[PDB]
Amino acid sequence: SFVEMVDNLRGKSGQGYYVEMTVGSPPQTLNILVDTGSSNFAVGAAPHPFLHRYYQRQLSSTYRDLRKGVYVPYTQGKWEGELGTDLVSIPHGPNVTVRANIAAITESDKFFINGSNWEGILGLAYAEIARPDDSLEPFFDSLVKQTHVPNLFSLQLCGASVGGSMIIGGIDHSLYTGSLWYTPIRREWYYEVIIVRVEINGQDLKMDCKEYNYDKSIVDSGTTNLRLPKKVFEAAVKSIKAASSTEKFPDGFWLGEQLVCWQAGTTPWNIFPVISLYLMGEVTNQSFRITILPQQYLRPVEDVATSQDDCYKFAISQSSTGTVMGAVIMEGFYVVFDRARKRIGFAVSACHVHDEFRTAAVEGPFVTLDMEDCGYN
Numbered sequence: 001s002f003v004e005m006v007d008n009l010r011g012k013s014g015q016g017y018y019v020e021m022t023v024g025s026p027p028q029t030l031n032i033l034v035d036t037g038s039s040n041f042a043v044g045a046a047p048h049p050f051l052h053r054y055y056q057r058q059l060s061s062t063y064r065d066l067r068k069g070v071y072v073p074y075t076q077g078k079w080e081g082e083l084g085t086d087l088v089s090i091p092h093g094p095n096v097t098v099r100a101n102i103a104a105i106t107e108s109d110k111f112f113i114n115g116s117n118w119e120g121i122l123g124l125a126y127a128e129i130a131r132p133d134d135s136l137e138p139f140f141d142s143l144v145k146q147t148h149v150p151n152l153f154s155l156q157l158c159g160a161s162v163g164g165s166m167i168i169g170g171i172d173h174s175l176y177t178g179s180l181w182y183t184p185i186r187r188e189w190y191y192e193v194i195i196v197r198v199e200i201n202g203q204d205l206k207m208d209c210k211e212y213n214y215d216k217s218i219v220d221s222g223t224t225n226l227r228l229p230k231k232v233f234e235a236a237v238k239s240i241k242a243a244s245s246t247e248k249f250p251d252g253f254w255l256g257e258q259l260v261c262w263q264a265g266t267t268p269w270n271i272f273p274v275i276s277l278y279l280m281g282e283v284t285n286q287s288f289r290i291t292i293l294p295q296q297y298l299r300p301v302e303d304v305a306t307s308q309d310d311c312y313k314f315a316i317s318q319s320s321t322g323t324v325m326g327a328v329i330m331e332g333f334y335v336v337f338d339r340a341r342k343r344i345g346f347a348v349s350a351c352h353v354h355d356e357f358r359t360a361a362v363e364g365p366f367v368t369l370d371m372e373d374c375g376y377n
């Protein structure tokens with residue numbers, strides 16, 4: 001039943017979308033970040049200032065210690081944990097319980113964030129990027145092996161008490177309108193895809209399309225921003241600046257380190273361009289585009305202290321590890337992770353972004369003469 005799964009996600013702007021899960025016997029309830037950009041199931045398992053609660057292994061009679069540790073450094077933050085297995089369920093997901101690997105986080109630095117309301121991360125990507133290595137079976141692989149659940153899930157993330165839906169085992173048509181367009185998964189590690197063209201307010205960036213995928217492009221619900229390779233980022237910022245030049249932006253705004261604010265309701269959306277990302281289609285040299293509005297890439301901040309005005313952070317940033325289509329891109333689209341057919345689908349979601357003049361869209365097909373492979377691999 002997909003209806004029971006609708007609206008099973010919550011979150012805070014720029015804080016992460018999480019689903020309720022249980023671990024252990026009897027079940028211990030925790031909120032878990034849904035992350036298509038990693039492959040470990042990892043949960044706080046010791047007290048922490050920012051943790052509202054944690055996994056208590058000694059209180060679970062079904063816990064099995066794997067007698068192995070794991071250290072996972074990120075660019076920002078890090079945690080250390082002990083690997084084990086236990087019974088895991090998703091109360092508002094599939095009606096099943098499975099035994100899964102769990103990394104019990106016993107030490108961390110700048111990993112858990114105050115007020116996020118999640119206590120762990122559910123890595124939904126593939127084993128190749130699991131830590132400490134690809135022999136640690138990811139949760140979704142365990143789910144499919146141990147149950148009759150079809151090998152796919154879909155995410156409908158809705159921007160700013162319900163934050164969206166994770167539907168496991170199929171597609172819920174009530175969550176999107178129009179056509180569902182599919183792009184192939186290039187390699188099963190991250191959810192890697194190929195961008196073939198980029199336009200900003202209708203204007204082609206006219207780069208070799210391999211530049212858009214240097215050194216990979218991925219779909220990642222565990223990253224807030226649209227992250228772009230240096231060359232593409234500079235070109236995008238140049239275009240957006242030119243379009244919005246009628247207004248001055250604080251030092252550091254384009255680096256994402258500063259807010260811009262307007263009086264309530266007066267945000268000049270119309271001076272900001274739409275961004276179109278064309279994704280490789282399922283047929284040779286065909287593609288489709290998803291169009292991103294400023295309502296997506298100018299992310300609202302919901303801090304009470306700033307609430308007299310409407311303030312935003314620039315949610316596009318520079319990457320040295322490839323393009324990342326993060327949450328601000330996924331928001332408003334229904335995104336189908338069709339692992340069974342090695343493809344990802346996009347459709348306009350019931351909570352898609354729009355104003356009176358413009359709307360997020362998924363459109364195709366588009367045809368390209370140049371037969372170059374846009375893969376950087």
Ligand SMILES: C[C@@]1(c2cccc(NC(=O)c3ccc(Br)cn3)c2)CCSC(N)=N1
Nearest residue numbers: 014015016035037038220221222223224327
């Ligand atoms: C595991 C890792 C990770 C670790 C620690 C926090 C996070 N994400 C967030 O805090 C986060 C915040 C707002 C949104 Br919207 C989505 N995610 C992600 C590593 C960095 S990139 C990634 N996808 N996953």
